[PDB]
Amino acid sequence: QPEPDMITIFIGTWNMGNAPPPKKITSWFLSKGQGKTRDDSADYIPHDIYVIGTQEDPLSEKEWLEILKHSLQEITSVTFKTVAIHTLWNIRIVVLAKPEHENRISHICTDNVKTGIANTLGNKGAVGVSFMFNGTSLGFVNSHLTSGSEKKLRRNQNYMNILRFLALGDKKLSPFNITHRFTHLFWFGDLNYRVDLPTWEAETIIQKIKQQQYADLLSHDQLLTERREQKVFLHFEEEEITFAPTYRFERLTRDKYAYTKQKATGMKYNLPSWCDRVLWKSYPLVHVVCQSYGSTSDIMTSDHSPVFATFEAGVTSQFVSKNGPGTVDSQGQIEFLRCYATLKTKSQTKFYLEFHSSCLESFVKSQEGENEEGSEGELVVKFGETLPKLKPIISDPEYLLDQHILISIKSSDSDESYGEGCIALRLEATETQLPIYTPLTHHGELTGHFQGEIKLQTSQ
Numbered sequence: 001q002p003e004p005d006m007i008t009i010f011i012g013t014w015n016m017g018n019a020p021p022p023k024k025i026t027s028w029f030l031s032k033g034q035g036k037t038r039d040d041s042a043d044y045i046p047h048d049i050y051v052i053g054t055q056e057d058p059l060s061e062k063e064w065l066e067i068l069k070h071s072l073q074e075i076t077s078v079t080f081k082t083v084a085i086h087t088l089w090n091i092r093i094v095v096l097a098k099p100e101h102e103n104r105i106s107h108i109c110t111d112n113v114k115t116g117i118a119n120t121l122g123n124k125g126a127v128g129v130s131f132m133f134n135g136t137s138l139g140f141v142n143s144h145l146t147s148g149s150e151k152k153l154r155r156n157q158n159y160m161n162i163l164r165f166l167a168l169g170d171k172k173l174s175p176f177n178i179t180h181r182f183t184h185l186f187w188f189g190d191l192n193y194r195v196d197l198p199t200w201e202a203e204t205i206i207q208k209i210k211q212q213q214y215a216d217l218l219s220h221d222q223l224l225t226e227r228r229e230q231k232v233f234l235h236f237e238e239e240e241i242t243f244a245p246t247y248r249f250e251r252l253t254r255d256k257y258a259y260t261k262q263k264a265t266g267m268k269y270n271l272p273s274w275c276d277r278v279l280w281k282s283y284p285l286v287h288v289v290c291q292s293y294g295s296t297s298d299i300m301t302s303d304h305s306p307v308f309a310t311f312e313a314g315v316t317s318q319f320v321s322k323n324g325p326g327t328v329d330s331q332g333q334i335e336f337l338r339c340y341a342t343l344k345t346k347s348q349t350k351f352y353l354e355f356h357s358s359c360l361e362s363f364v365k366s367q368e369g370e371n372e373e374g375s376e377g378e379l380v381v382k383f384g385e386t387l388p389k390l391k392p393i394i395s396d397p398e399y400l401l402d403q404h405i406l407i408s409i410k411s412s413d414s415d416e417s418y419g420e421g422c423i424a425l426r427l428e429a430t431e432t433q434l435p436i437y438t439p440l441t442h443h444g445e446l447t448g449h450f451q452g453e454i455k456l457q458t459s460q
């Protein structure tokens with residue numbers, strides 16, 4: 001029975017509005033409703049992994065697990081295995097997988113982050129799950145961010161706190177936050193970004209939604225505008241939105257948006273918005289294709305509609321050679337030529353690099369680079385031809401070309417990372433000098449760039 005080189009992943013996000021679900025929720029897991037929907041001919045084909053994020057979830061873990069498993073059983077005639085479940089307040093994540101994957105899944109981690117201080121600590125934050133699927137690391141974050149049209153900056157701060165403090169994946173990757181720890185990272189939830197148009201335009205917005213004319217609304221979506229201005233979710237992807245706003249509905253129908261200010265809303269307007277979202281970030285040159293992104297039309301117990309997204313994701317096998325794991329393969333090497341970091345920092349410490357990869361027995365520290373002044377004020381750290389030759393555990397090109405090198409640039413004075421990035425080994429050629437490049441981030445914000453050349457030697 002061969003190991004897969006691709007899997008499909010279902011991502012669901014639903015703010016349940018503190019109400020129990022209706023009897024039937026199969027449309028969610030079938031990617032049926034509005035937007036980019038799944039072909040009917042696929043309805044009986046199970047996804048490999050289902051990741052369900054809820055917010056304002058009033059159910060116990062047991063109660064929701066029974067509903068989810070019975071739903072998937074009805075669709076697929078497969079009894080799915082529970083990988084992980086984790087709840088913070090009323091924010092929950094469930095990971096289910098086909099039984100055939102049980103011995104492919106390992107290193108399961110869960111964590112949560114509580115956002116805010118005092119007043120604003122007690123119901124918002126995030127839960128997450130990570131695991132290895134054969135040779136591929138997968139991370140999943142369900143966040144419920146701060147509500148209200150005039151709090152986009154708070155939502156951005158919630159995002160930065162979650163990616164800094166959520167402790168998932170390989171703890172040995174100490175310089176790296178969740179935005180670098182996984183081959184594929186999916187971040188979803190009630191992100192609570194709104195369509196920023198004047199209150200007086202509510203009926204105009206409703207009109208546009210009825211005509212399925214979303215362009216003038218999406219051009220005011222706060223998540224899209226904040227992402228374009230590099231204020232949040234830097235280096236993440238989102239499929240194009242082709243479904244109606246998923247908030248705020250009158251319950252028990254989808255015919256009416258309930259936007260007017262009420263005591264129950266704190267006298268705030270809730271103009272129709274795309275609160276409920278799925279984004280992802282995958283390592284460079286790894287296969288990831290969104291095959292659905294939409295909302296259900298027939299699940300009406302909440303003031304939000306459920307959102308679905310599905311993905312094809314490339315995965316690799318748990319590789320064994322005669323040599324690695326447990327030794328090097330002298331026939332393999334990774335060389336860096338003419339490398340330099342450009343940093344936005346005002347500081348003047350010396351810097352060194354760390355190279356982290358599961359193709360190495362352990363991480364590799366470089367010598368300090370040579371600081372120069374860049375023309376337009378910047379710090380340039382030159383490594384020249386000084387970088388250590390990296391010795392992978394396996395030399396087979398079928399393994400090595402699928403790997404990635406994480407890079408941290410660290411202060412000699414404090415040993416703190418000033419920037420993190422990632423280089424793919426999926427090169428156009430081996431034994432050939434080729435340009436490499438990554439942006440560098442810290443706490444998910446841009447701090448610099450790393451560029452140079454690579455020379456990869458495989459056993460072929």
Ligand SMILES: Cc1noc(C)c1C(=O)NCCC1CCCCC1
Pocket residue numbers: 026043044074075076077
């Ligand atoms: C989808 C769906 N949603 O609700 C219901 C009920 C279904 C359904 O009929 N599933 C049958 C699954 C089968 C397995 C493989 C081929 C034979 C059929």
